[PDB]
Design a protein around this ligand. Structure first.
Ligand SMILES: NS(=O)(=O)c1c(F)c(F)c(S(=O)(=O)CCO)c(NC2CCCCCCC2)c1F
Length: 258
């Protein structure tokens, strides 16, 4: 089964998921010189309710915070999107060392980690699972993390990691302030792409924020002690969980800002 180890990692995913070499795969390199500002993008609207957060779990591939999404309390609108995309989950990608770990790379710059906020088109589709199979089904906000002063807004997450050390563990997680994990500017890049994990479906409108947030080295290290293995199984550590950028293959990246 797929992961980020030598014999199950990204270079092998095409073996079971040949859309891995598709034309709209993510993540990507953003070459700013080539990006065009687009004045037709609407203001980005983020309404998030802390009570929408329900559980945090270790999926084996990251931690996932899952939200109650039968309600429009927490939704992403505006920007490049038509309609209301309901918040579903939040997770994080990192590498085995602090100098690289983000999935998107900007003018050859990698950050230490990248948070993803996954939303789905509940104005058109019946469920997140369904919406993952349509082109306009998903919208994912990416936020880079750079090494800097520790980030107090990550404490609710970091405090839970020992409780979810093994794959499959879950813990009650509500009253989560997601909005405060976002940087003060929301200027972004946007392009059509895919999930960055199997099944790699090409159903995502990416919205990648330019401004990073901080994380300290000590805080980032706590994520690498999560296991990709379940209880009662020989331990392996989730020290890296980022897919490398894939080629643009003709797509253009748009900017929210000039
Ligand atoms: N990196 S990603 O944003 O493209 C993404 C999704 F968009 C996404 F929807 C998911 S999913 O997990 O919610 C199932 C999609 O059908 C994951 N998840 C992966 C990494 C984080 C751990 C939990 C999900 C299992 C793989 C995921 F990584």
């Amino acid at each position: 089964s797929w992961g980020y180890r030598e014999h199950n990692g990204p270079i092998h995913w095409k073996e079971f998921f040949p859309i891995a070499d598709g034309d709209q795969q993510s993540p990507i390199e953003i070459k700013t010189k080539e990006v065009k500002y687009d004045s037709s993008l609407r203001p980005l609207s983020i309404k998030y309710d802390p009570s929408s957060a329900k559980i945090i779990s270790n999926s084996g591939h990251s931690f996932n915070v899952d939200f109650d999404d039968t309600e429009n309390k927490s939704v992403l609108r505006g920007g490049p999107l038509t309609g209301s995309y309901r918040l579903r989950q939040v997770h994080l990608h990192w590498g085995s060392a602090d100098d690289h770990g983000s999935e998107h790379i900007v003018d050859g710059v990698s950050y230490a980690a990248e948070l993803h906020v996954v939303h789905w088109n509940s104005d058109k589709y019946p469920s997140f699972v369904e919406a993952a199979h349509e082109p306009d089904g998903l919208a994912v906000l990416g936020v880079f993390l750079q090494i800097g002063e520790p980030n107090s807004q990550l404490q609710k997450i970091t405090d839970t990691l020992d409780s979810i050390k093994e794959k499959g563990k879950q813990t009650r997680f509500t009253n989560f302030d997601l909005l405060s994990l976002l940087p003060p500017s929301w200027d972004y890049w946007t392009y059509p792409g895919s999930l960055t994990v199997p099944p790699l479906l090409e159903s995502v409108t990416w919205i990648v924020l330019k401004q990073p947030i901080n994380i300290s080295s000590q805080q980032l290290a706590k994520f690498r002690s999560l296991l990709c293995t379940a209880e009662g199984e020989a331990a392996a550590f989730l020290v890296s969980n980022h897919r490398p950028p894939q080629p643009l293959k003709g797509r253009k990246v748009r900017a929210s800002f000039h």
